Short mmCIF file of N, CA, C and O and ligand atoms in Angstrom, two decimals:
data_model
loop_
_atom_site.label_atom_id
_atom_site.label_comp_id
_atom_site.label_asym_id
_atom_site.label_seq_id
_atom_site.Cartn_x
_atom_site.Cartn_y
_atom_site.Cartn_z
N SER A 1 -10.14 3.27 29.03
CA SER A 1 -11.83 3.06 29.29
C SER A 1 -12.85 1.88 29.16
O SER A 1 -12.90 1.06 28.04
N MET A 2 -13.78 1.95 29.83
CA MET A 2 -15.01 0.89 29.41
C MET A 2 -15.27 1.36 27.63
O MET A 2 -15.79 0.53 26.93
N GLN A 3 -15.54 2.73 28.36
CA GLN A 3 -16.84 3.36 27.17
C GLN A 3 -15.27 3.34 25.68
O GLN A 3 -16.43 3.27 24.64
N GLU A 4 -14.18 3.43 25.97
CA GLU A 4 -13.39 3.75 24.52
C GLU A 4 -13.46 1.63 24.40
O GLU A 4 -13.58 1.81 22.81
N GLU A 5 -13.73 1.06 25.25
CA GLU A 5 -13.24 -0.31 24.89
C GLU A 5 -13.81 -0.79 23.96
O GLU A 5 -14.01 -2.00 22.78
N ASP A 6 -16.32 -0.38 24.49
CA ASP A 6 -16.65 -0.85 23.49
C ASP A 6 -16.88 -0.07 22.22
O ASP A 6 -17.31 -0.96 21.24
N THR A 7 -16.53 1.78 22.12
CA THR A 7 -16.69 1.94 20.87
C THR A 7 -15.36 0.57 19.91
O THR A 7 -15.98 0.67 18.60
N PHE A 8 -14.54 0.16 20.23
CA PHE A 8 -14.03 -0.75 19.45
C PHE A 8 -14.39 -2.00 19.33
O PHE A 8 -13.93 -2.18 18.58
N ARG A 9 -15.12 -2.33 19.90
CA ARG A 9 -15.86 -3.53 20.20
C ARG A 9 -17.12 -3.95 18.80
O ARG A 9 -16.64 -4.56 17.65
N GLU A 10 -17.74 -1.92 18.61
CA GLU A 10 -18.87 -1.28 17.62
C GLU A 10 -18.20 -1.67 16.24
O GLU A 10 -18.51 -1.73 15.40
N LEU A 11 -16.87 -0.76 16.05
CA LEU A 11 -15.59 -0.62 15.39
C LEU A 11 -15.30 -2.34 15.09
O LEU A 11 -15.52 -2.36 13.35
N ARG A 12 -14.80 -3.39 15.61
CA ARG A 12 -14.86 -4.07 15.36
C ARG A 12 -15.46 -5.42 14.19
O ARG A 12 -15.73 -6.34 13.16
N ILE A 13 -17.44 -5.34 14.63
CA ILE A 13 -19.07 -5.67 14.25
C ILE A 13 -19.16 -4.57 13.15
O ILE A 13 -19.15 -5.56 12.39
N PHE A 14 -18.47 -3.82 13.17
CA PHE A 14 -19.10 -3.11 12.00
C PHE A 14 -17.62 -3.59 10.37
O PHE A 14 -18.14 -3.67 9.82
N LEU A 15 -17.05 -3.59 10.82
CA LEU A 15 -16.04 -3.72 10.39
C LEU A 15 -16.15 -5.82 9.81
O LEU A 15 -15.36 -5.61 8.46
N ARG A 16 -16.61 -6.09 10.40
CA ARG A 16 -16.56 -7.58 10.27
C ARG A 16 -18.23 -7.55 9.02
O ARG A 16 -17.92 -8.90 7.97
N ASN A 17 -19.18 -7.96 8.98
CA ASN A 17 -20.34 -7.39 8.79
C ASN A 17 -19.59 -6.65 6.74
O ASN A 17 -19.70 -7.26 6.60
N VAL A 18 -18.96 -5.87 6.23
CA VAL A 18 -18.70 -5.13 5.26
C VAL A 18 -18.23 -6.07 4.31
O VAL A 18 -18.39 -6.82 3.63
N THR A 19 -16.71 -6.60 5.35
CA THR A 19 -15.76 -7.84 5.36
C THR A 19 -16.58 -9.63 4.29
O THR A 19 -16.65 -10.15 3.22
N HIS A 20 -17.69 -10.06 5.25
CA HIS A 20 -18.02 -10.74 4.75
C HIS A 20 -18.95 -10.94 4.35
O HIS A 20 -19.36 -11.25 3.00
N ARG A 21 -20.41 -9.24 3.82
CA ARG A 21 -21.16 -9.31 2.56
C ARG A 21 -20.20 -8.54 1.25
O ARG A 21 -20.30 -9.27 0.45
N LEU A 22 -18.64 -8.46 1.54
CA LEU A 22 -17.95 -8.42 0.34
C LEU A 22 -17.65 -9.76 -0.26
O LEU A 22 -17.10 -10.06 -1.71
N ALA A 23 -16.81 -11.01 0.88
CA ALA A 23 -16.58 -11.75 1.04
C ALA A 23 -18.17 -13.33 0.08
O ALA A 23 -17.00 -13.78 -0.43
N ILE A 24 -19.22 -12.72 0.21
CA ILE A 24 -20.19 -13.92 -0.27
C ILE A 24 -20.77 -12.90 -1.83
O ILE A 24 -20.98 -13.26 -2.73
N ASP A 25 -19.88 -12.66 -2.34
CA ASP A 25 -20.47 -11.95 -3.63
C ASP A 25 -19.61 -12.43 -4.92
O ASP A 25 -18.24 -12.39 -4.84
N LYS A 26 -19.91 -12.76 -5.69
CA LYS A 26 -19.16 -14.24 -7.27
C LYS A 26 -17.97 -13.35 -7.89
O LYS A 26 -17.77 -14.60 -7.86
N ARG A 27 -18.75 -12.39 -8.14
CA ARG A 27 -17.20 -10.87 -8.28
C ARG A 27 -15.87 -11.57 -7.29
O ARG A 27 -14.96 -11.36 -8.80
N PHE A 28 -15.81 -11.57 -5.98
CA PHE A 28 -14.46 -11.73 -5.21
C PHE A 28 -14.06 -12.28 -4.75
O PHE A 28 -13.36 -12.38 -4.21
N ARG A 29 -14.95 -14.02 -5.58
CA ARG A 29 -13.93 -14.90 -5.35
C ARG A 29 -12.59 -15.05 -4.50
O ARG A 29 -11.67 -15.77 -4.36
N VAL A 30 -12.01 -14.31 -5.97
CA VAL A 30 -10.84 -14.73 -6.56
C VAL A 30 -9.66 -13.91 -5.17
O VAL A 30 -8.71 -14.17 -5.15
N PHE A 31 -10.76 -12.64 -4.28
CA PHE A 31 -9.60 -12.30 -4.08
C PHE A 31 -10.58 -13.01 -2.24
O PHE A 31 -9.85 -12.08 -0.72
N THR A 32 -11.35 -14.03 -2.20
CA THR A 32 -11.56 -14.88 -0.76
C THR A 32 -9.97 -15.17 -0.18
O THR A 32 -9.85 -15.43 1.51
N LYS A 33 -9.53 -15.90 -1.02
CA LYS A 33 -8.53 -16.79 0.06
C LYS A 33 -6.75 -16.52 -0.51
O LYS A 33 -6.42 -15.83 -1.56
N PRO A 34 -5.85 -16.59 0.11
CA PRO A 34 -4.48 -16.47 0.17
C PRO A 34 -4.47 -17.14 -1.42
O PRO A 34 -4.87 -18.09 -1.53
N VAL A 35 -2.78 -16.35 -2.73
CA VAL A 35 -2.95 -17.24 -3.20
C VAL A 35 -1.94 -17.93 -2.92
O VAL A 35 -0.80 -18.43 -2.45
N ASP A 36 -1.76 -19.36 -3.37
CA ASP A 36 -1.27 -20.78 -2.98
C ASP A 36 -0.32 -20.62 -3.62
O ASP A 36 0.42 -20.79 -5.06
N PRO A 37 0.80 -20.92 -3.11
CA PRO A 37 2.34 -20.59 -3.46
C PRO A 37 2.75 -21.59 -4.78
O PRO A 37 3.44 -21.65 -5.54
N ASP A 38 2.06 -22.75 -4.31
CA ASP A 38 2.37 -24.70 -5.54
C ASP A 38 2.19 -23.57 -6.18
O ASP A 38 2.40 -23.34 -7.39
N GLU A 39 0.63 -23.87 -6.68
CA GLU A 39 0.11 -23.23 -7.99
C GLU A 39 0.16 -21.54 -8.62
O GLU A 39 0.75 -22.09 -9.80
N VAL A 40 1.29 -20.86 -7.56
CA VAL A 40 1.08 -19.24 -8.21
C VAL A 40 2.99 -19.26 -7.23
O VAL A 40 3.18 -18.53 -6.49
N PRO A 41 3.84 -19.96 -7.96
CA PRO A 41 4.85 -19.31 -6.86
C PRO A 41 6.27 -18.62 -7.23
O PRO A 41 6.96 -18.10 -6.43
N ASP A 42 5.14 -18.16 -8.23
CA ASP A 42 6.15 -16.33 -9.55
C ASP A 42 5.45 -15.41 -8.06
O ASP A 42 6.08 -14.15 -7.70
N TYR A 43 4.13 -16.03 -7.00
CA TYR A 43 3.41 -14.08 -6.94
C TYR A 43 4.75 -13.84 -5.96
O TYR A 43 4.30 -13.18 -5.91
N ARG A 44 4.93 -14.29 -5.04
CA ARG A 44 5.69 -13.73 -3.79
C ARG A 44 6.83 -13.15 -4.66
O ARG A 44 7.26 -12.41 -3.21
N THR A 45 7.54 -12.84 -5.10
CA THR A 45 8.89 -12.76 -6.30
C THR A 45 7.89 -11.65 -5.69
O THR A 45 8.48 -10.35 -6.09
N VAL A 46 6.84 -11.71 -6.60
CA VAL A 46 6.69 -10.03 -7.14
C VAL A 46 5.47 -9.42 -5.91
O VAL A 46 6.07 -7.97 -6.00
N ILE A 47 4.65 -9.59 -5.65
CA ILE A 47 4.01 -9.39 -4.65
C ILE A 47 4.64 -9.11 -2.75
O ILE A 47 4.59 -10.48 -2.26
N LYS A 48 4.98 -8.54 -2.63
CA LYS A 48 5.98 -8.13 -1.54
C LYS A 48 4.97 -7.84 -0.65
O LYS A 48 5.33 -8.95 1.10
N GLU A 49 3.79 -7.86 -0.12
CA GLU A 49 2.71 -8.11 0.76
C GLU A 49 0.94 -8.18 0.81
O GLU A 49 0.47 -7.55 0.30
N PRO A 50 1.30 -9.98 0.22
CA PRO A 50 0.22 -10.65 -0.51
C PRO A 50 -1.29 -9.57 1.02
O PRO A 50 -1.13 -9.71 1.68
N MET A 51 -1.91 -9.86 0.50
CA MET A 51 -3.05 -9.41 1.05
C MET A 51 -4.40 -10.10 0.38
O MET A 51 -4.81 -9.91 -0.34
N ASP A 52 -5.81 -10.85 1.30
CA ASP A 52 -7.44 -11.01 1.00
C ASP A 52 -8.65 -11.12 2.42
O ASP A 52 -7.71 -10.73 3.54
N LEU A 53 -9.07 -11.06 1.44
CA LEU A 53 -10.15 -11.44 2.28
C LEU A 53 -10.09 -12.53 4.04
O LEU A 53 -10.87 -10.99 5.26
N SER A 54 -9.61 -13.00 4.07
CA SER A 54 -9.50 -14.00 4.83
C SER A 54 -8.71 -14.12 5.56
O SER A 54 -8.94 -13.72 7.08
N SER A 55 -7.68 -13.36 4.87
CA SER A 55 -6.40 -12.73 6.63
C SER A 55 -7.09 -11.12 6.46
O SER A 55 -6.99 -11.16 7.99
N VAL A 56 -8.23 -10.23 6.48
CA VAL A 56 -8.76 -9.52 7.06
C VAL A 56 -10.26 -9.48 7.96
O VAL A 56 -9.19 -9.07 8.87
N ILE A 57 -9.83 -10.42 8.40
CA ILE A 57 -10.93 -11.52 8.96
C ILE A 57 -10.25 -11.56 10.28
O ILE A 57 -10.40 -11.10 11.11
N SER A 58 -9.87 -12.29 9.36
CA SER A 58 -7.99 -12.50 10.92
C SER A 58 -7.14 -11.52 11.41
O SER A 58 -7.59 -11.34 13.34
N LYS A 59 -7.31 -9.92 11.45
CA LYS A 59 -6.82 -8.76 11.56
C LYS A 59 -7.34 -8.35 12.59
O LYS A 59 -7.50 -7.84 13.62
N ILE A 60 -9.04 -8.63 11.89
CA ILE A 60 -10.08 -7.21 12.82
C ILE A 60 -10.16 -8.17 13.99
O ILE A 60 -10.02 -7.71 14.90
N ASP A 61 -10.25 -9.43 14.12
CA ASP A 61 -10.11 -10.82 16.00
C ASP A 61 -9.00 -9.97 16.53
O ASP A 61 -9.33 -10.19 17.52
N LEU A 62 -7.59 -9.93 15.72
CA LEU A 62 -6.84 -9.30 16.24
C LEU A 62 -6.12 -7.80 17.02
O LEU A 62 -5.61 -8.20 17.35
N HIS A 63 -7.90 -7.40 16.90
CA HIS A 63 -7.32 -5.99 17.05
C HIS A 63 -6.45 -5.09 16.16
O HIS A 63 -5.82 -4.52 17.42
N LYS A 64 -6.07 -5.55 14.75
CA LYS A 64 -5.23 -5.15 14.89
C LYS A 64 -5.67 -3.48 13.83
O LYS A 64 -5.13 -3.31 13.45
N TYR A 65 -7.07 -3.25 13.69
CA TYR A 65 -7.24 -2.01 13.21
C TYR A 65 -7.95 -1.76 13.85
O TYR A 65 -9.05 -1.69 14.58
N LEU A 66 -7.62 0.45 14.72
CA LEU A 66 -8.45 0.51 15.34
C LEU A 66 -8.92 2.05 14.34
O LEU A 66 -9.64 2.62 15.49
N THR A 67 -9.68 2.59 13.43
CA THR A 67 -10.38 3.60 12.11
C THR A 67 -10.04 2.83 11.34
O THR A 67 -9.81 1.83 10.88
N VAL A 68 -11.72 3.31 10.69
CA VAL A 68 -12.02 2.95 9.46
C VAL A 68 -10.80 2.93 8.14
O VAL A 68 -10.24 2.49 7.34
N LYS A 69 -10.17 4.13 8.30
CA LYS A 69 -8.41 4.12 7.62
C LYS A 69 -7.72 2.94 7.25
O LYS A 69 -7.40 3.00 6.42
N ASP A 70 -7.08 2.98 8.73
CA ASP A 70 -5.94 1.56 8.76
C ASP A 70 -6.95 0.39 7.66
O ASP A 70 -6.31 -0.37 7.48
N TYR A 71 -8.57 -0.23 7.93
CA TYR A 71 -9.08 -1.09 7.38
C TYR A 71 -8.87 -0.80 5.37
O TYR A 71 -8.46 -1.85 5.04
N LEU A 72 -9.34 0.82 5.09
CA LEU A 72 -8.98 0.67 3.71
C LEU A 72 -7.75 0.78 3.84
O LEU A 72 -7.49 0.24 2.26
N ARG A 73 -7.29 0.73 3.93
CA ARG A 73 -5.54 0.64 3.62
C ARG A 73 -4.85 -0.97 2.76
O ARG A 73 -5.20 -1.12 2.38
N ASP A 74 -5.76 -1.98 3.86
CA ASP A 74 -5.70 -3.21 3.54
C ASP A 74 -6.38 -3.59 2.54
O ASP A 74 -5.86 -4.37 1.58
N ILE A 75 -7.87 -3.22 2.37
CA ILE A 75 -9.13 -3.18 0.97
C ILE A 75 -7.91 -2.86 -0.62
O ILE A 75 -7.69 -2.99 -0.70
N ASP A 76 -7.46 -1.79 -0.44
CA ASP A 76 -6.01 -0.47 -1.26
C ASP A 76 -5.28 -1.68 -1.23
O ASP A 76 -5.25 -1.72 -2.94
N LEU A 77 -5.27 -2.73 -0.47
CA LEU A 77 -3.62 -2.74 -1.27
C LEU A 77 -4.43 -4.88 -1.89
O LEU A 77 -3.13 -5.07 -2.46
N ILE A 78 -5.18 -5.18 -1.70
CA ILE A 78 -5.89 -6.35 -1.86
C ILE A 78 -5.70 -5.82 -3.22
O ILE A 78 -5.53 -6.34 -4.73
N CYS A 79 -6.55 -4.47 -3.74
CA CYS A 79 -6.68 -4.05 -5.28
C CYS A 79 -5.28 -3.61 -6.23
O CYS A 79 -5.11 -3.97 -6.55
N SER A 80 -4.65 -2.68 -5.01
CA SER A 80 -2.79 -2.19 -5.95
C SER A 80 -2.44 -3.84 -5.94
O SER A 80 -1.94 -4.07 -7.52
N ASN A 81 -2.20 -5.22 -5.48
CA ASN A 81 -1.85 -5.68 -5.49
C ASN A 81 -2.06 -6.78 -6.89
O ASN A 81 -1.83 -7.28 -7.97
N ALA A 82 -3.98 -6.64 -7.26
CA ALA A 82 -4.16 -7.66 -7.97
C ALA A 82 -4.29 -6.68 -9.86
O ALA A 82 -3.48 -7.85 -10.69
N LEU A 83 -3.82 -5.48 -9.09
CA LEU A 83 -3.25 -4.58 -10.55
C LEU A 83 -2.07 -4.36 -11.20
O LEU A 83 -1.78 -4.66 -11.81
N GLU A 84 -1.32 -4.72 -9.29
CA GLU A 84 0.61 -4.92 -10.05
C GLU A 84 0.73 -6.01 -10.93
O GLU A 84 1.08 -6.24 -11.83
N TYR A 85 0.06 -7.21 -10.30
CA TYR A 85 0.48 -8.67 -11.08
C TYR A 85 0.19 -8.70 -12.48
O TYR A 85 0.41 -10.14 -12.68
N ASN A 86 -1.12 -8.35 -12.59
CA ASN A 86 -1.83 -8.24 -13.86
C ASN A 86 -1.95 -7.80 -14.58
O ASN A 86 -3.44 -6.98 -15.06
N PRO A 87 -1.33 -7.52 -15.50
CA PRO A 87 -1.10 -5.76 -15.80
C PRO A 87 -1.34 -5.16 -17.70
O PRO A 87 -0.99 -4.84 -17.82
N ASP A 88 -1.60 -6.68 -17.85
CA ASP A 88 -1.55 -6.75 -19.52
C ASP A 88 -2.38 -6.27 -20.44
O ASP A 88 -3.97 -6.57 -19.78
N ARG A 89 -2.86 -6.57 -21.28
CA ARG A 89 -3.98 -6.68 -22.23
C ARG A 89 -5.12 -7.77 -22.44
O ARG A 89 -6.26 -7.58 -23.29
N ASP A 90 -4.31 -8.63 -22.49
CA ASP A 90 -5.08 -10.33 -22.24
C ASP A 90 -6.90 -9.89 -21.55
O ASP A 90 -6.27 -9.53 -20.88
N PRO A 91 -7.68 -11.26 -21.94
CA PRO A 91 -8.76 -10.79 -21.38
C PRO A 91 -8.84 -11.17 -19.82
O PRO A 91 -9.54 -10.64 -18.86
N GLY A 92 -7.33 -12.23 -19.51
CA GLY A 92 -8.01 -13.05 -18.29
C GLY A 92 -7.20 -11.99 -17.19
O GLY A 92 -8.29 -11.45 -16.01
N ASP A 93 -5.84 -10.61 -17.70
CA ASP A 93 -5.73 -9.55 -17.39
C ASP A 93 -7.00 -8.62 -16.78
O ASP A 93 -7.51 -8.35 -15.14
N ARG A 94 -7.74 -8.48 -17.63
CA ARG A 94 -8.52 -6.95 -18.17
C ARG A 94 -9.38 -7.89 -17.26
O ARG A 94 -10.19 -6.59 -16.36
N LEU A 95 -9.62 -8.99 -16.94
CA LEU A 95 -10.60 -9.08 -15.81
C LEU A 95 -10.82 -8.40 -14.89
O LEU A 95 -11.31 -8.99 -14.03
N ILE A 96 -9.28 -9.65 -13.45
CA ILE A 96 -9.41 -9.36 -12.75
C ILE A 96 -8.84 -7.62 -12.31
O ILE A 96 -9.45 -7.47 -10.65
N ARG A 97 -8.70 -7.34 -13.11
CA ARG A 97 -8.26 -5.78 -12.83
C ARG A 97 -9.81 -5.35 -12.95
O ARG A 97 -10.11 -4.11 -11.47
N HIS A 98 -11.21 -5.12 -13.43
CA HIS A 98 -11.65 -4.82 -13.77
C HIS A 98 -12.84 -5.32 -12.12
O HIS A 98 -13.50 -4.72 -11.75
N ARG A 99 -12.41 -6.66 -12.26
CA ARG A 99 -13.07 -7.13 -10.28
C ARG A 99 -11.81 -6.67 -9.38
O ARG A 99 -13.22 -6.43 -7.79
N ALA A 100 -11.53 -6.26 -8.78
CA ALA A 100 -10.35 -6.19 -8.30
C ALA A 100 -10.99 -4.09 -8.20
O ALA A 100 -10.83 -3.82 -6.26
N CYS A 101 -11.47 -3.59 -8.99
CA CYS A 101 -11.86 -1.70 -8.87
C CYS A 101 -12.89 -1.91 -8.57
O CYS A 101 -13.26 -0.85 -7.76
N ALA A 102 -13.48 -3.06 -8.78
CA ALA A 102 -14.96 -2.56 -8.27
C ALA A 102 -14.46 -3.60 -6.44
O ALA A 102 -15.93 -2.80 -5.44
N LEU A 103 -14.18 -4.24 -5.68
CA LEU A 103 -14.23 -4.89 -4.53
C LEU A 103 -13.86 -3.76 -3.87
O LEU A 103 -14.02 -2.87 -3.00
N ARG A 104 -13.14 -2.71 -4.45
CA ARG A 104 -12.36 -1.42 -3.47
C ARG A 104 -13.51 -0.14 -3.92
O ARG A 104 -14.56 0.55 -3.40
N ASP A 105 -14.46 -0.15 -5.19
CA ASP A 105 -15.62 1.32 -4.98
C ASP A 105 -16.88 0.22 -4.04
O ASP A 105 -17.11 1.81 -3.75
N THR A 106 -16.95 -0.91 -4.06
CA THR A 106 -17.96 -0.54 -4.03
C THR A 106 -17.50 -0.86 -1.60
O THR A 106 -18.50 -0.35 -0.96
N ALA A 107 -16.53 -1.22 -1.21
CA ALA A 107 -16.05 -0.99 -0.03
C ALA A 107 -16.21 0.42 1.13
O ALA A 107 -16.93 0.55 1.21
N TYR A 108 -15.54 1.15 -0.44
CA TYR A 108 -15.67 2.59 0.15
C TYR A 108 -17.63 2.81 0.37
O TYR A 108 -17.75 3.47 0.53
N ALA A 109 -17.67 2.74 -0.89
CA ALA A 109 -19.25 3.40 -1.35
C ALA A 109 -20.51 2.24 -0.03
O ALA A 109 -21.41 3.20 0.45
N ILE A 110 -20.53 1.16 0.50
CA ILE A 110 -21.06 0.63 1.77
C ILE A 110 -20.31 1.83 3.33
O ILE A 110 -21.33 1.84 3.68
N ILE A 111 -19.06 2.32 3.53
CA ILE A 111 -18.33 3.12 3.91
C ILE A 111 -18.79 4.43 3.98
O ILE A 111 -19.74 4.87 4.93
N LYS A 112 -19.55 4.97 2.89
CA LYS A 112 -19.76 6.28 3.27
C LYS A 112 -20.97 6.67 3.08
O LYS A 112 -21.90 7.25 3.85
N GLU A 113 -22.28 5.33 2.83
CA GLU A 113 -23.92 5.29 3.28
C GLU A 113 -23.82 4.68 4.55
O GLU A 113 -24.69 4.83 4.98
N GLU A 114 -22.37 4.34 5.21
CA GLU A 114 -22.92 3.48 6.43
C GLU A 114 -22.41 3.57 7.58
O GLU A 114 -23.13 3.34 9.06
N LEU A 115 -20.98 3.91 7.00
CA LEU A 115 -20.67 5.30 8.76
C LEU A 115 -20.49 6.07 9.07
O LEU A 115 -21.14 7.52 7.96
N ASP A 116 -21.06 6.47 10.57
CA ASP A 116 -21.68 7.92 10.94
C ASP A 116 -19.91 8.81 10.75
O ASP A 116 -18.88 7.68 11.28
N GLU A 117 -19.78 10.31 10.16
CA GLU A 117 -18.19 10.91 10.53
C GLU A 117 -18.17 11.02 11.68
O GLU A 117 -17.00 10.72 11.73
N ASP A 118 -18.68 10.98 12.44
CA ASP A 118 -18.63 11.11 14.18
C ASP A 118 -17.97 9.95 14.92
O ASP A 118 -17.23 9.79 16.04
N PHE A 119 -18.62 9.11 14.04
CA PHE A 119 -18.11 7.35 14.77
C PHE A 119 -16.08 7.28 14.64
O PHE A 119 -15.79 6.56 15.95
N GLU A 120 -16.29 7.78 13.14
CA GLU A 120 -15.11 7.54 12.31
C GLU A 120 -13.85 8.34 13.67
O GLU A 120 -13.04 8.67 13.44
N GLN A 121 -14.37 9.72 13.63
CA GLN A 121 -13.41 11.26 14.28
C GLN A 121 -13.38 10.47 15.75
O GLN A 121 -12.06 10.22 16.46
N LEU A 122 -14.07 9.79 16.00
CA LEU A 122 -13.54 9.21 17.96
C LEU A 122 -12.82 8.11 17.79
O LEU A 122 -12.06 8.01 19.42
N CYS A 123 -13.07 7.47 17.30
CA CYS A 123 -12.40 6.34 16.56
C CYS A 123 -10.26 6.83 15.79
O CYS A 123 -9.84 6.40 16.89
N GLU A 124 -9.96 8.14 15.86
CA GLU A 124 -9.11 8.49 15.22
C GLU A 124 -8.17 9.13 16.76
O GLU A 124 -7.21 9.47 16.96
N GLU A 125 -9.27 9.47 17.80
CA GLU A 125 -8.53 10.95 18.53
C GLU A 125 -8.76 9.40 20.11
O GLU A 125 -7.99 9.50 20.50
N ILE A 126 -9.16 8.29 20.12
CA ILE A 126 -8.92 7.29 21.06
C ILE A 126 -7.38 6.56 21.28
O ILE A 126 -6.84 6.64 21.36
N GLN A 127 -7.48 6.60 19.36
CA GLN A 127 -6.16 6.44 18.68
C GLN A 127 -4.85 7.17 18.50
O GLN A 127 -4.02 6.56 18.98
N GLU A 128 -5.57 7.69 18.56
CA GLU A 128 -4.01 9.67 19.15
C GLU A 128 -3.82 9.07 20.31
O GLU A 128 -2.60 10.24 20.60
N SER A 129 -4.41 9.33 21.53
CA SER A 129 -4.11 9.21 22.23
C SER A 129 -3.58 8.36 23.05
O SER A 129 -3.30 7.99 24.36
N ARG A 130 -3.23 7.47 22.18
CA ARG A 130 -2.46 6.81 23.05
C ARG A 130 -0.39 5.85 22.41
O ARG A 130 -1.11 6.73 21.38
C1 LIG B 1 -5.59 -20.35 -10.87
C2 LIG B 1 -5.19 -19.51 -12.31
N1 LIG B 1 -5.41 -18.22 -11.60
C3 LIG B 1 -5.99 -16.30 -12.36
C4 LIG B 1 -5.53 -15.76 -10.85
C5 LIG B 1 -4.14 -14.48 -11.85
C6 LIG B 1 -3.73 -14.83 -10.62
C7 LIG B 1 -3.69 -13.74 -9.52
O1 LIG B 1 -3.44 -12.24 -8.75
N2 LIG B 1 -4.54 -12.47 -7.69
C8 LIG B 1 -4.75 -13.32 -7.38
C9 LIG B 1 -6.27 -13.49 -6.27
C10 LIG B 1 -5.17 -14.74 -8.60
C11 LIG B 1 -5.59 -15.69 -8.66
O2 LIG B 1 -6.84 -15.99 -8.52
C12 LIG B 1 -5.39 -16.35 -10.02
C13 LIG B 1 -4.65 -17.93 -10.24
N3 LIG B 1 -3.29 -15.96 -10.54
C14 LIG B 1 -2.25 -16.23 -8.94
C1 LIG B 2 -27.12 11.78 9.18
C2 LIG B 2 -27.71 9.82 10.30
N1 LIG B 2 -27.11 9.46 10.50
C3 LIG B 2 -27.72 7.84 11.08
C4 LIG B 2 -27.48 6.77 10.11
C5 LIG B 2 -27.05 5.43 10.23
C6 LIG B 2 -26.23 5.83 9.91
C7 LIG B 2 -26.37 4.95 8.90
O1 LIG B 2 -25.75 2.99 8.93
N2 LIG B 2 -27.10 2.75 7.33
C8 LIG B 2 -27.39 4.50 6.86
C9 LIG B 2 -27.67 3.71 5.19
C10 LIG B 2 -26.84 5.26 7.84
C11 LIG B 2 -27.31 6.57 7.44
O2 LIG B 2 -28.32 6.45 7.31
C12 LIG B 2 -26.55 6.99 9.22
C13 LIG B 2 -26.69 8.82 9.24
N3 LIG B 2 -25.15 6.87 9.85
C14 LIG B 2 -23.83 7.00 8.92
#
């Protein structure tokens, strides 16, 4: 219905605003673009599903997310990819792990404080009806 298309349009506006706010924080600059396969040819042999904040904005615009749950699965993949690729005790590794955990906690805290529980339940019921 037209009312259902208006629901999904409101969801995309909300997700773009969350994602752009994460993308301007100086801590998260390393997550804003894909890993350059030149500089890091090894990356794509270890990490099977690369993900970054530029890719997330492209996916919103292609209508790939019908719920906040499916968006948070991509935020979780940005974080898990950084933890898996950089697991060592050295400071470079420890700094990117700390930043990855901060990105995930920041996204969850914005959504907890700014999404109504009933808007997300409506998106999940339209999704399950398709
Ligand atoms: C050129 C200096 N490198 C330091 C970082 C460690 C590792 C990494 O893991 N996730 C991302 C994103 C990145 C890149 O920022 C990075 C580039 N590497 C491929
Ligand atoms: C319980 C009634 N809700 C009204 C508000 C609308 C929306 C929202 O957007 N930013 C913030 C902050 C808030 C919350 O205060 C709120 C709680 N919602 C999640």
